[PDB]
Amino acid sequence: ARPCIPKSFGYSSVVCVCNATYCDSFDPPTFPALGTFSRYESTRSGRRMELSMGPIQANHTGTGLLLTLQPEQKFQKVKGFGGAMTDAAALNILALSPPAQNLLLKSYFSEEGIGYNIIRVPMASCDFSIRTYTYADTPDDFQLHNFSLPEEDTKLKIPLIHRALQLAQRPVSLLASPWTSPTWLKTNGAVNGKGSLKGQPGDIYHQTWARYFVKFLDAYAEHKLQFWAVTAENEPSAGLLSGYPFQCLGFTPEHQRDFIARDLGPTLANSTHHNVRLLMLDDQRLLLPHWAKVVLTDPEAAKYVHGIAVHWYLDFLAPAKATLGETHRLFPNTMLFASEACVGKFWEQSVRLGSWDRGMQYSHSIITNLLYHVVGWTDWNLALNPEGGPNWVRNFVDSPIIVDITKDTFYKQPMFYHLGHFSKFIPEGSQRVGLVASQKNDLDAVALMHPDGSAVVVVLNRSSKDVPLTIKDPAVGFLETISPGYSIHTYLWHRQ
Amino acid sequence: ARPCIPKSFGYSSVVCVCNATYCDSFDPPTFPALGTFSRYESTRSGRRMELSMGPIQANHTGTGLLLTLQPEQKFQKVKGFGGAMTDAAALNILALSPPAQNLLLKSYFSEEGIGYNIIRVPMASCDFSIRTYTYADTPDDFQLHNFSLPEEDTKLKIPLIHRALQLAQRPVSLLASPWTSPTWLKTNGAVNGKGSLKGQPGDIYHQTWARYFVKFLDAYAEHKLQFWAVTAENEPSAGLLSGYPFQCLGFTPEHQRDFIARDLGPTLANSTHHNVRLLMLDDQRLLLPHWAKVVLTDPEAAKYVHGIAVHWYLDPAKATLGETHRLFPNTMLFASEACVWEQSVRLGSWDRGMQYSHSIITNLLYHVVGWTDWNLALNPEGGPNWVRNFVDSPIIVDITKDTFYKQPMFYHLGHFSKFIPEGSQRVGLVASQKNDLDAVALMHPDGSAVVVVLNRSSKDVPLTIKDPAVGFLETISPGYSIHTYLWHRQ
Ligand SMILES: *[C@@H]1O[C@H](CO)[C@@H](O[C@@H]2O[C@H](CO)[C@@H](O)[C@H](O)[C@H]2NC(C)=O)[C@H](O)[C@H]1NC(C)=O
Ligand SMILES: *[C@@H]1O[C@H](CO)[C@@H](O[C@@H]2O[C@H](CO)[C@@H](O)[C@H](O)[C@H]2NC(C)=O)[C@H](O)[C@H]1NC(C)=O
């Protein structure tokens, strides 16, 4: 294990500096006897996933907030955590020298880093691309004889995905999402703007677009990569907006329903890739529950939909209970998955190196999602440059890893450690369980049980004040602790 | 009546061009004869509040969309419509030659224009200012002995407000809102950024800030202007945000509750300005209903609060506005600020016009009694604005050409403001089938009917409106149109 080398860039906290020969890392996981807990702590003052152990005791000395584990109250099982292998992320990673590349990929994907087990893969170009291609730009090729993967896939994304999977001990799930079709399949003949598929569900355009998903899965399978899931379209609502500035494809909820029922579901079902799951929406949660009602009340569509993918950036427009909570209530057997998280307030830089606030927004998001049935998370770009790019629209935003190619250096932002407090300690198949607060409080907290029955609890303090805290496990006893101002803690313990 | 002079700037629709000697206007208002209806139409294709009249028919057959009036299903009474006399708006208006100024003010405030009866007045500087003053910038002036109105009030805002009221036949209501206090009343000692009043409600900082409201009202009254209402603060949630880029003053809901209960309510009530109403929140409706519950469940605060002011951000009404009305049905909701990748000003944008009328209809369907635009006029950059926070406005002034452009937004607003007088009551309007149209119905004080219909689709929609007192209005909603229908009921 090597500790964080901190650097300040004038924001509220530090980044951790990594280069070709040095990156902060953990020892292999090692858990103590019954009656002992492990605690990982990150603070604005600069602690970075620092490990301590202490006792779980029969006597309760705390007189403040008590959080009681309720392991018999069982909620959703976790699919996992990860991020997006965009053209931009791949270009940034591959501009580092190979030993620095390896330390960046280990940070995300190794047991000595934060244990990502999901990668989101754009199907061809998006805003985080240096140009505007699809896999079939040759027109009137309805059988897609001329479908092919460019350099962005075969040189940048695919090789990095292989390397991520080699580093990971956990099985990694790949999730694919398209931004645009070939422009010759669109009403507007453009990669962006207001435009849908030509014609109507079932026709040659819709069948060709469904066939494009299979050709994509075929091409990645030729490179020994298989997908867990695909989404029906990235942000289908974007392609209904006049002037939408980057790659999109517009679907009303009704057009998505009929595309899935008539074309995408049947085409995937008749392929060698019939085991690949299909997620719907892949868009802002303010569109719920309406979008879920329109698609999932049609059995011919609902039979092909595994889950509902949500994006975070317009979360402040619509509360979790009215969107995620009501959707679960109406469709309790259709999982919710967060497929795109994003941060970067119109008066701030795209990238703020060492922003504690942006880190707290990530952990607060993850806890709210877990409290409203969400089973997984994919962050957006795995890495960007210090401008938040490259992006062909200049739609610059923040990322948990910032690469400075000119110094063969990468910086791990507070966002990286806020994500890791979840991703490292919540493996696939973990189940959220009850955690009861004894009184009103300012903390964000969530409890889960590992597949082996061991406990994990995350506690976020977004306040400036230290909060004395007891955690009770009815089977073990009392963990007496403190949640410092501007801190995040992950607690782990055996229950027998 | 003079028709629109259209000009394209290459976007979806046209502006109407006005100058020192020409501006589009209406003939004095008339009412359609009993048994007939009036229709005013604006289209993307270029029609601007064009008047036609049709017969009300005794019978109707067919499968087509029917909207039925429910005159006995009564909802909110309307306070009115208008916009904001910012420093930026007044500076732009007064840079035109005097005759062009008069045609601009007539466009908004005349019965021959669109009949505005609201003006929102910033208390000192905001982002739509060219500098960052307050009325009391002398440090630690707790007695406000150096309170004074600068030239932005005495030379720009106040003279234009007097001229607006002179042109309006309808009584105009003035609404006042502060962005920042003096910096010496603030924890951060700056006009912008994260910062709230120093100390605690009841103390000398909070009493001084409340007496600043009375000094403002006193100074405007010395200029023979009286206010209908003040808000407790513009966007109090903004001053809770680090780096907030322009004038702000942070309040949590609890701080707003306690400032109103301890300081602003009693101070206003003990003044010669006790008839002035107080609106709370003056912020994004996503803060409802929580903010309303915090303030209005305290009787010590509730007894001072007439209304809840909401801001729109145009670019879920039931859960915010609807739930608030349900909890607090005797506390009016009022939309006090609305504005619209793309460039700040898009001359001739039909899309931005449709955002305005869609907003007003959604608001009217959820208990809102009034709708206040932001800047009455900006320049073609969307300024001036000291932080470059440029936005669009229904009227764009081209000082170099002594010209102003009436945007589609102006006509989308006018389809409501011109035809919905103060005291109009929203009534029920039921669709016979699901449809892409936005519609709302109201009754004028005098009993007559008004219906606005907006079509945000490309498809013409045949439709009938049924009023059981008179019969059937057979009409069409063309794609990318807005219509206002008027008829007498007896
Ligand atoms: C990569 O980062 C590491 C750690 O910051 C740097 O290693 C340090 O090098 C200095 C001076 O060159 C030594 O005296 C320190 O003891 C080193 N720390 C450790 C733990 O080794 C290394 O210099 C960096 N590489 C480059 C090219 O700057
Ligand atoms: C103010 O605008 C009006 C209306 O466009 C201009 O008056 C028109 O001028 C044109 C071109 O000279 C004539 O052909 C029209 O017949 C005029 N219409 C009317 C009703 O007069 C006027 O020239 C503009 N003033 C300035 C200073 O540009």
Ligand SMILES: *[C@@H]1O[C@H](CO)[C@@H](O)[C@H](O)[C@H]1NC(C)=O
């Ligand atoms: C404050 O008021 C005093 C007394 O009326 C006056 O002499 C002085 O000029 C004022 N200060 C400012 C900055 O206007």
